[PDB]
Design a protein around this nucleic acid. Structure first.
Lengths: 150, 38, 79, 129, 135
RNA sequence: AGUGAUUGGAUGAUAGGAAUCCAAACCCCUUUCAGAGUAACAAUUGGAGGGCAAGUCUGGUGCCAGCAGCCGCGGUAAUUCCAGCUCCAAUAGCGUAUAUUAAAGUUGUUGCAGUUAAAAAGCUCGUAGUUGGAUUUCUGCUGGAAGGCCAAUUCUAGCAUCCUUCUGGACUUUUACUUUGAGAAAAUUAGAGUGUUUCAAGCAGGCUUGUCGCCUUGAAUACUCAGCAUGGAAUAAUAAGAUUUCGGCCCUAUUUUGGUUUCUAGGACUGAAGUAAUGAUUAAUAGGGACGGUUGGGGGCAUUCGUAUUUAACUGUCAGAGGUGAAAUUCUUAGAUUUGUUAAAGACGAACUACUGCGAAAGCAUUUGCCAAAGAUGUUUUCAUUAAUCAAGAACGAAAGUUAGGGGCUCGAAGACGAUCAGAUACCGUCGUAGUCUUAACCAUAAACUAUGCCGACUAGAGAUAGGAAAACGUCAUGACUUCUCCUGCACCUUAUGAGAAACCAAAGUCUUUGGGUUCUGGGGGGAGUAUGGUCGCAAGGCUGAAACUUAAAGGAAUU
RNA sequence: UACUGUAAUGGACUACCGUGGCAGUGACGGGUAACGGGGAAUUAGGGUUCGAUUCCGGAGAGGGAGCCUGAGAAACGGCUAC
């Protein structure tokens, strides 16, 4: 039932049975890895690469074509982000709400939602420190959060 | 105590809303009288 | 009176994606032919972005809820 | 969310037993369930079952007969000490004659009848009768 | 419901010792107020002197005058009213006469027809049954 | 086969010896002279309405005396009192009082209950705590030792590419778990053997004209979390995520007193060529995040509109208007109430408005714009267990109320009169201050209700409905409608060999055929949400929260 | 860290030096009509209550304190003091 809301939604991508598809496809393992390193250099997140691939170009999935996932390829090349994308987009959301909330102080609903996103940042950071995807002793501060994004 | 039943009024009774108020007036009085003897 | 091992093609087509016996996607890919160019482009059925041509950008399809609309008379062949 | 995989499937089984279905599917399937269903199948409480190999946990579809009155699960998985297998089934099972406790042991998953003669206790898993 | 899991000894053990006190009979045992309360000292019987001869009336429906005695326990000099069992025997008591007091058999509380929890077992050590019988 | 004092003849209680016992008496065990016929050597203790086994008996008493653990007997005919007679229960014992155990599934791990009976925090966040998806040498054939029974069941070696340093232990991440074993005083407890005359006991005895007596005499055995040890393939925690031959480098002990210095022998340190498939499980009808077109009376800040109500203005006309069950207070020729056109003011958003939507709950209905935010749906995107539930602790929390400024139309706790009435500080009527509205703080409770905690699985259909999505040579002109399927919402109807005390219930089902995970609460009714202490509050009061004494019923759902 | 003291180990004690140690898994404090255990009562299993008292430890000899002799006592049917 999600997490924070009461909503209980079943919507998801359901991946196919066969692997290394498709028979119709060709190109190469090598040429796809060049395209990913090109678009990462353009400045584009691991989610946004695989959207750009399956939409315009071929490849349904990169894990089908190459052995590796997209973030595995970026981290091998050394064109990976500093912090992971889900933690990035939660912090950027929290900074956006703090601009709104210190303009409009009487908005109680915005004050409620800022607790929920910043609570999620703290617990999701505690994951990423355990897996060593973040430097040790890395912590969220609402003073220094805005410069940390961009 | 009483909790939820508090006002069940299953059988002829004083009425809870009134009862709570009556006890409040007794209690309020207890305060000033106890502070008077300080 | 029932057959969970061998379900019917008609009924399992109606069901949701994940509730089928083997889950697999009801989306697909398309070799699209825009009117001007002789070139062809491999385009996903549900496209979230406005897809441009192989040279001098026309426009293949605009994104919607589910399946993207294809721009005027232009043919498409499923893979 | 979904702590015990075996605990869901035996409730799914025993419901659709009592309704009186010929066969049922269960989900998400495991290595423990196929071994638990295997030691039902020896004693003759269910028929065949397939296990579809979807690229996921997988679905187990069992043919069954009108034979199980009930099967259940003992969470928490208590420890028991060969002395105390007799004390459990006096409490738990409907009679001394028929029924089975079933309990994981370092010589594989097995019934309490097999656990007596091999002479090793373990952790209790569930039961059926 | 309960916590079933193997490491839930504290929650199970703590809940009993807290909610044991919700019993009425558990509190009468295990509180410290048992020793201050009662005129008896957690004891079966107790001697005392009959300060006065008294009469009390049973609550309706029953009506009558029950003939009890007010006594002071020797150990604590605490006054109590003790009922005198059987017909008469009031004559037997004599003010200032030592009388054994025994529980009415209801663990305090009250008996039948008001507010009396004790019975006089013996008078001058003679005992009530011997005299009523006359044996 | 039982009765019938009708007679009738056949062992110790007792008293004294004998020997035995005893350190000296004494008791027991033996044997002795006396020793029962209402077997006067005389069995009592509690009961006889119910629970509870056993009298609609007969006198006395008359809500008196008294019984009565509880329900109840007694007011002049008592199946309960006080007696007599008869019968019942236990019996050399039986009744009473206090504490305690079972009964108590009325403390519930096994094993209770929480819609209405006692009891789900008003609602979300959340740290410990508790609990956590699937997945990593499985199958087959040939032996070997045992093995119960008229080949099953154990254990074990091989062979499908399976270590080695040696001649049993070193390595296999680490424990828990289970198995066997060690060590752990007896007495007590269970228990083997044995006629203490039986028995509770005790640890003794038993054979036998044999004499260095014998049974190479018995007095077994079990039992005694944490700790030490060990076989093991599951389950569950937990850990992690190089090799093969060559040299520089460099320290350190045996044998042929100390200094000397090589040698070889072996360490830990860093290059050069070679080998091995050179080294990352899936992507949960778990979760987070991205992207797409939408949806909403969700939130904040502006802005704008609509009649009405009250006041004021003029403009008519002229005696009533108001209000009630019926009247009065009140307003009125110094022109009310009604007619019309304006203007100001501050509220409130009718009808459309629904067994509809949105929101964590409280709650949220005029137009337009701006600012962030959310769900569902779609997805051959992405990360890969990041999760569930939550002692402390934290945010929001109608109405009323408080504090300090604005605003004050209407309504209106108090107060005021006028009625009604026996009275009426009320219902009804006419005025009317706080309040109602708003900015800035507080307060923290409501029948804050679905009186039903929150995640998850599975149970049963039909027709509606809100949102999104796909299909149709569909009908009319990107959209409205028709037909059909999918999830996600608020519900509704029907029915159950499902449940319940019943009312009723797709959850209150899958619970004596009792265990998916977890938080909080309750233990007869009062006393009492009181007292005292604590802590929060500017106060009002909130949260926490007893006892003495009191009482046999309170309470639930249906029936007449 | 280094003495001292003891039958020996130790903040046991003394000099200097550092700022630690325990606690929500309940520290610290209060109550016990509390000596602990081997055990006792209680007729499914799980439990609940008791254990001054036959044995094994512990402590005490009206209350506290001090000490001699000796292998051993802070002894009390030994001594000194309040």
């Amino acid at each position: 039932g999600r997490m924070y809301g009461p909503g209980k939604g079943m919507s998801a991508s359901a991946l196919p049975w066969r692997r290394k598809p498709p028979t119709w496809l060709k190109i190469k393992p090598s040429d796809v890895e060049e395209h990913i390193a090109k678009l990462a250099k353009k400045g584009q997140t691991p989610s946004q690469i695989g959207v750009t691939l399956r939409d315009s170009f071929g490849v349904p999935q990169v894990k089908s074509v190459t052995g590796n996932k997209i973030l595995r390829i970026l981290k091998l090349q050394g064109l990976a982000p500093e912090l992971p994308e889900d933690l990035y987009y939660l912090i950027k959301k929290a900074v956006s709400v703090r601009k709104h909330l210190e303009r409009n102080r009487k908005d109680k609903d915005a004050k409620f939602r800022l607790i929920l996103v910043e609570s999620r940042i703290h617990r999701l950071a505690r994951y990423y420190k355990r897996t060593k995807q973040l430097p040790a002793t890395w912590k969220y501060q609402s003073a220094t959060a805005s410069a940390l994004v961009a | 105590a009483h909790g939820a039943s508090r006002y069940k009024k299953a059988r002829a009774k004083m009425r809870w809303k009134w009862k709570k108020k009556r006890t409040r007036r007794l209690q309020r009085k207890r305060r000033k009288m106890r502070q008077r003897s300080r | 009176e029932i057959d969970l091992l061998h379900p019917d093609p008609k009924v399992e087509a109606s069901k949701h994606k994940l509730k089928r016996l083997i889950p697999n996607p009801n989306s697909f890919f398309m070799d699209v032919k825009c009117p001007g160019c002789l070139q062809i482009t491999t385009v996903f059925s549900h496209a979230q972005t406005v897809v441009l041509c192989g040279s001098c950008n026309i426009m293949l399809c605009q994104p919607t809820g589910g399946k993207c609309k294809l721009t005027e008379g232009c043919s498409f062949r499923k893979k | 969310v979904r702590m015990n995989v075996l605990a869901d499937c035996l409730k799914t089984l025993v419901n659709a037993e009592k309704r009186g279905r010929r066969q049922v599917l269960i989900r998400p399937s495991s290595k423990v369930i196929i071994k638990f269903l295997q030691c039902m199948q020896r004693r003759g409480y269910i028929g065949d079952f397939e296990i579809v190999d979807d690229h996921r946990a997988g679905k187990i579809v069992i043919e069954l007969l009108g034979r199980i009155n009930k099967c259940g699960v003992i969470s928490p998985r208590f420890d028991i000490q060969v002395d105390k297998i007799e004390q459990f089934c006096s409490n738990l099972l409907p009679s001394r004659q028929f029924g089975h406790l079933v309990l994981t042991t370092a010589y594989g998953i097995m019934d309490h009848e097999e656990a007596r003669r091999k002479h090793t206790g373990g952790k209790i898993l569930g039961y059926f009768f | 419901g309960k916590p079933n899991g193997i490491r839930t000894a504290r929650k199970l053990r703590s809940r009993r010792r807290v909610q044991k006190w919700a019993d009425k009979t558990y509190k009468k045992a295990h509180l410290g107020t048992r020793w201050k309360a009662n005129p008896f000292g957690g004891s079966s019987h107790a001697k005392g002197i009959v300060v006065e001869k008294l009469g009390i009336e049973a609550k309706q429906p029953n009506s009558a005058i029950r003939k009890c005695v007010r006594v002071q326990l020797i150990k604590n000099g605490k006054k109590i009213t003790a009922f005198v069992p059987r017909d008469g025997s009031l004559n037997y008591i004599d003010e200032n006469d030592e009388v054994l007091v025994a529980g009415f058999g209801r663990s305090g509380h009250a008996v039948g027809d008001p507010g009396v929890r004790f019975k006089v077992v013996k008078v001058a050590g003679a005992s009530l049954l011997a005299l009523f019988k006359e044996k």
